[PDB]
Amino acid sequence: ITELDQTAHQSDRLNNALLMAIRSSANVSSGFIEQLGGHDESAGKRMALSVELNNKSQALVDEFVENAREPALRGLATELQATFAEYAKAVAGQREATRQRSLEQYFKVNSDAGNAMGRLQTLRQQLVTTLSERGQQIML
Amino acid sequence: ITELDQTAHQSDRLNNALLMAIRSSANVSSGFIEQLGGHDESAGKRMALSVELNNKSQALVDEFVENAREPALRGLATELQATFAEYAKAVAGQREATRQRSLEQYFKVNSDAGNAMGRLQTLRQQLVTTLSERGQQI
């Protein structure tokens, strides 16, 4: 029954990582809105929240890769880690666009992140399916 | 295996509902900045996506809560229903502010929204853990 809890924790890492990665990009936009409204300190707070959420998401993504040992899982896990690196740099580019106070630059790397996020969602769906297949197999 | 397939469907309803709810508010803040930059066509598209995502995730949460009859679940399922009702109330306020293009209105509910998503995340974990235990209770 130890192997089942291990699969469930891989599932939680995956679902938590994606949720916090989306939150992180959302907080960048909220920070940019605060700055355009004259609240530079609250913009600073939202920037810190975005980096925090992104760093936690990255920690969970790497934990998932490290604890992935089933061969049907590791090929996708590598893809998830590479694709998340893409998403992180785009969110970093969003925080940098906030720094420039450049709006048209913000829209460019915002589309970047949404593009990479769309591929993270497809990868998450494959891994959840691989994970829960493995869990159901242990039970049968 | 039918009782196991329903705890599987229940976890899928919950995980999808959260992902779409977080995406719904992210589209509103992205839409709001797009209005500030003059990208009004794009912002209108983000608002339509946010309303559709809110509608589907509300439908998934509703179905999840109504099917959560188990005693270890009912309390947490009620907490999710309450928490999600207060999240949709804040994201709807973010959308109202963006349509009115009011920075003042946006700043009233933007913290309400973001805070509740963290709690949604917390409750998802507590619920999936309880569902995973009932699933292996077989």
Side-chain angles (χ1 to χ4, degrees):
Chain A
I1 207 152
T2 278
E3 294 78 346
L4 274 170
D5 289 321
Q6 215 298 293
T7 295
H9 187 157
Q10 291 286 76
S11 282
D12 294 338
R13 294 180 173 118
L14 194 48
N15 284 288
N16 284 314
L18 263 281
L19 282 166
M20 290 186 300
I22 301 170
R23 284 173 70 185
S24 159
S25 176
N27 272 286
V28 178
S29 301
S30 306
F32 209 167
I33 297 168
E34 292 272 354
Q35 183 171 70
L36 293 169
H39 309 110
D40 294 315
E41 295 92 336
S42 305
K45 187 75 116 98
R46 289 285 160 147
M47 289 296 119
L49 181 53
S50 159
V51 176
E52 207 216 337
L53 286 155
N54 222 70
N55 281 0
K56 284 182 166 57
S57 175
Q58 181 90 63
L60 291 178
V61 160
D62 296 346
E63 286 171 28
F64 179 88
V65 171
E66 283 137 36
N67 296 267
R69 285 151 163 191
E70 170 186 14
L73 212 60
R74 264 126 84 61
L76 299 169
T78 297
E79 274 185 270
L80 184 85
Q81 203 177 39
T83 305
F84 185 85
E86 260 163 279
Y87 179 81
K89 178 60 210 76
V91 178
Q94 270 166 246
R95 292 191 305 267
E96 167 87 322
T98 296
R99 194 75 24 78
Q100 263 55 86
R101 281 147 186 263
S102 42
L103 284 173
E104 302 285 340
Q105 182 45 42
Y106 187 83
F107 305 136
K108 287 169 215 172
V109 293
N110 185 316
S111 84
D112 243 300
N115 185 47
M117 175 50 71
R119 297 183 285 110
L120 281 161
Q121 313 221 70
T122 301
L123 280 163
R124 174 198 162 269
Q125 296 183 292
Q126 289 175 281
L127 285 157
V128 172
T129 288
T130 311
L131 279 170
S132 100
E133 168 173 4
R134 174 67 174 145
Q136 183 77 342
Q137 132 154 162
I138 294 166
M139 285 173 167
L140 295 161
Chain B
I1 67 100
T2 80
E3 251 164 349
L4 253 167
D5 117 294
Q6 194 57 217
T7 77
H9 281 115
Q10 278 284 85
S11 285
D12 277 321
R13 295 183 187 111
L14 171 62
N15 293 328
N16 295 345
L18 251 61
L19 271 152
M20 303 171 112
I22 190 43
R23 283 177 63 209
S24 177
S25 158
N27 274 291
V28 181
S29 306
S30 290
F32 192 92
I33 295 186
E34 269 143 56
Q35 282 184 0
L36 294 171
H39 285 225
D40 293 302
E41 218 141 319
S42 177
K45 283 207 195 299
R46 304 271 206 165
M47 304 303 281
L49 182 59
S50 159
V51 164
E52 185 84 2
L53 288 167
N54 182 20
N55 284 344
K56 307 280 186 161
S57 72
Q58 186 73 259
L60 291 179
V61 161
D62 291 337
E63 185 72 17
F64 175 91
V65 171
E66 294 160 12
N67 284 5
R69 328 200 185 114
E70 302 70 12
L73 269 185
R74 50 163 88 132
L76 284 157
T78 308
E79 188 164 0
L80 173 72
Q81 190 156 242
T83 306
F84 193 95
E86 299 310 300
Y87 175 78
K89 204 194 194 303
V91 177
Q94 281 180 312
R95 287 196 300 266
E96 235 280 80
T98 309
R99 296 185 182 110
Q100 225 74 228
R101 316 175 103 258
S102 159
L103 266 304
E104 323 81 63
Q105 277 173 234
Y106 185 89
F107 293 143
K108 319 283 224 126
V109 304
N110 68 336
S111 297
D112 293 5
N115 287 330
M117 175 51 54
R119 187 47 182 191
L120 289 181
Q121 221 177 266
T122 290
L123 292 169
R124 191 216 71 91
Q125 184 61 66
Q126 304 172 298
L127 279 162
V128 174
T129 286
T130 311
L131 293 163
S132 175
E133 263 147 20
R134 162 68 176 167
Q136 80 187 26
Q137 229 193 335
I138 316 302

